[PDB]
Design a protein around this nucleic acid. Structure first.
Ligand code: CA
Ligand code: CA
Ligand code: CA
Ligand code: CA
Ligand code: CA
Ligand code: CA
Ligand code: CA
Ligand code: CA
Ligand code: CA
Ligand code: CA
Ligand code: K
Lengths: 109, 115, 112
RNA sequence: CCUGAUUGGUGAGGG
RNA sequence: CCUGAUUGGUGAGGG
RNA sequence: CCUGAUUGGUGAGGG
């Protein structure tokens, strides 16, 4: 589905303030398989898309929230990296309240 | 690490380190711990989770299981060494004589549940 | 006291104790060590009262072939063993210097 | 050779 | 061999 | 009860 730029900015902001996160397809997938992932953010410009094509299905199966952001380069920066990130998983939010809200807004779509 | 057979909550890890600190007689280090388990005098074996190469302590869980000796884990070898009264790390510790029988029995039971 | 030990040699006995890597302090631990055959040298204080507490040691060591000697005071022996109190007897399990022990055991074995 | 505790019961010293 | 960062958690290094 | 370290690995504490 498509997420509004307003929300994406909030998603990127959410990753930036998070206390603990996982960066990278391998670690994100593990975080979801272990169920320690609270929210999963996925980049829309991942090529080949096959790298993250399995995430949406896995999250729903594990009952974990997930949304998309336009830039993997932007997602990586929000994760504290100097390089891109195809996906990120928030393990410990920065502001519990905001997260619960952000998650609800996403679940709407 | 593959040698860590089960997850021990941080609160219980604290209890394990406390047990080591209050113990009347312990063995510290892989060689003395292994000798104690083989001699059958260990009552509880505590293994650090961050030992590398893992091969140094990987035999302990299996050995204890064979001897019917209780074992558990703590996250840091540095913390375990400190609890054992050292200024350095310890990959493992064996409690030979606990400080209080009842406390040990309760702790061992809590571990057997996590097991 | 089966034999007399020169003050100079008693000093060496006390120093051997202080330098040892592993010792047993006290009648029960000394006796257990001799019985288990891990004691290399037993030192007995001469002013133990009742003397019955350590009376068995000379015979036990002889029966085990373990070297033993005496020192004037239990207070000094205890201090040498690292205690703040007296010790009726001490057993050296692991000395600090092999050569020295062998030399001391010799000096004592000739005094007997 | 230089570095200098970044090492360490993952086994020192002694027997 | 040349180019020289155009590559990149899309998994380096380590165990 | 008083004395108050005169006691003490000549075996405390723990298992
Ligand atoms: Ca250090
Ligand atoms: Ca240091
Ligand atoms: Ca050695
Ligand atoms: Ca670039
Ligand atoms: Ca670049
Ligand atoms: Ca590729
Ligand atoms: Ca006194
Ligand atoms: Ca006193
Ligand atoms: Ca008495
Ligand atoms: Ca007792
Ligand atoms: K590393």
């Amino acid at each position: 589905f498509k997420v509004p730029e307003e929300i994406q900015k909030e998603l990127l902001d959410a990753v930036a303030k998070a206390q603990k996160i996982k960066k990278g397809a391998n670690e994100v997938t593990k975080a979801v398989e272990r169920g320690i992932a609270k929210l999963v953010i996925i980049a829309e410009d991942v090529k080949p898309e096959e790298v993250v094509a399995h995430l949406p299905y896995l999250c729903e199966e594990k009952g974990i929230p997930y949304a998309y952001v336009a830039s993997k380069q932007d997602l990586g920066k929000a994760a504290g990296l100097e390089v891109a990130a195809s996906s990120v998983a928030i393990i410990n939010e920065g502001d519990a309240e905001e997260l619960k809200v952000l998650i609800e807004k996403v679940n709407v779509l």
